């Protein structure tokens, strides 16, 4: 008449803060631009969308 109650459940490993993958919903991308222009014997940088 003696009984043993065995109990168990599943959780995030200690590694979850360091080793993880993120699942994202990606939508409507914002396009941005820049570039190199040889202007008046000098190189100028233009960054634009």
């Amino acid at each position: 008449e003696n009984t043993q109650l065995s109990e168990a459940h599943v959780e995030k490993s200690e590694s979850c803060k360091t080793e993880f993958a993120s699942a994202y919903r990606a939508h409507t991308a914002s396009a941005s631009a820049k570039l190199r222009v040889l202007y008046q014997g000098n190189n100028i940088t233009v960054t634009a969308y």
Binding site: Y24, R25, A26, H27, S30
Partner: protein, 49 residues
């Protein structure tokens, strides 16, 4: 037993569905919108003030 029905997407309206499993007494289930949710993925461009 899988009971399949279709209700209009209208909140605050109680709908009655008759579950008829063959050889078993009929079962009436009342269903009323719970609170569906459409959460879009947001990407902050800027804030204004």
């Amino acid at each position: 037993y899988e009971h399949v029905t279709v209700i209009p997407n209208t909140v605050g309206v109680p709908y009655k569905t008759l579950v008829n499993r063959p050889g078993y007494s009929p079962m009436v289930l009342e269903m009323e919108l719970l609170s569906v949710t459409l959460e879009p993925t947001l990407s902050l461009d800027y804030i204004t003030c």
